[PDB]
């Protein structure tokens, strides 16, 4: 019965009409605005909340569940390609989750710059690609990573690690896989520029984990939901709290689709967590 029939139907229940009044109005104020004509949102109904934004032409969103602060993201388009490289630079990115598979990016049709196999210069700022190691997550599911170096006159020179998922009932295995994949990478990054001493270790709007695929509320949400699973600081957390508050950060789509639901389900009757508040 607490993760019966009965209780899944309630918390869709509760979900889906936080999904509906968080869907965004014409020129919303909740909502980060594009000036100019300069396409912000790669979706017309999937945007940005502006009380979270990270950048003012980014579709970016600081994201703390529970105790876990993150930070998901849309793809970049082409045109946000040099304020991206400045938000990863600035957060002191510990780690970079890209979960759109390699066959999306290849696919010009959905114009996605693959900006983290490849070198190049983007305006003020040239990136560095370096591949690394190959993670296998179960299933076949790969997990390619890169070394980006970011590198603007003037500016600190910083390297971000990288978590490529090139592919998407297992999935609960495969996430808790790649979760802890991206947990341990973070550590290890976060811990480097702790032995060096850096201003950002205080300010915790950085060092934030930066996922995103397509959209950044599909597989990211399902990503972020395992991070803070697997977080020590978040207990009795329900699985209501944990999805509404990453929508009210965002926007009501994160944790889009009923499957990626079910995963962040199962996860936490593994824990024994609640699924609904009280």
């Known amino acids: ?65 529970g ?15 040099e304020s991206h490289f400045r938000m990863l630079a ?25 900006y983290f196999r490849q070198s190049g210069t983007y305006g003020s700022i040239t990136v560095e690609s370096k591949m690394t190691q190959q993670v296998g997550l179960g299933d076949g599911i790969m997990a390619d990573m890169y070394t980006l170096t970011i590198r603007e006159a003037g500016q600190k020179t910083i390297s971000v690690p990288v978590v490529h998922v ?40 950085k060092l934030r984990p930066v996922i995103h695929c397509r959209a950044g509320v599909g597989r990211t949400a399902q990503l972020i939901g395992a991070m803070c699973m697997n977080d020590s600081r978040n207990s009795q957390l329900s699985v209501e709290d944990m999805v509404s508050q990453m929508r009210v950060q965002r926007n009501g789509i994160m944790v889009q689709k009923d499957e990626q639901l079910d995963v962040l389900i199962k996860l936490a009757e593994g824990q024994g967590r609640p699924l609904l508040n009280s």
């Open 90 to 114: 600035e957060n002191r990115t510990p780690v970079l989750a890209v979960l759109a598979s390699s066959s999306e990016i290849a696919n010009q049709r959905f114009g996605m710059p693959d």
């Open 1 to 65: 019965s607490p993760y019966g029939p009965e209780a899944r139907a309630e918390l869709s229940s509760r979900l889906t009409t936080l999904r509906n009044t968080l869907a965004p109005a014409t020129n919303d104020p909740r909502y980060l605005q594009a000036c100019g004509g300069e396409k912000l949102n790669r979706f017309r109904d999937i945007q940005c909340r502006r009380q979270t934004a990270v950048r003012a032409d980014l579709n970016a969103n600081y994201i703390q569940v």
């Open 166 to 205: 090139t592919t998407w009932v297992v999935s609960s295995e495969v996430t808790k896989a790649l979760a802890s994949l991206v947990d341990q990478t973070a550590e290890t990054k976060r811990n480097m520029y702790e032995s060096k001493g850096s201003s950002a270790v205080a300010d915790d709007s």
């Open 67 to 81: 105790n876990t602060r993150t930070i998901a993201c849309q793809y970049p388009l082409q045109s946000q390609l």
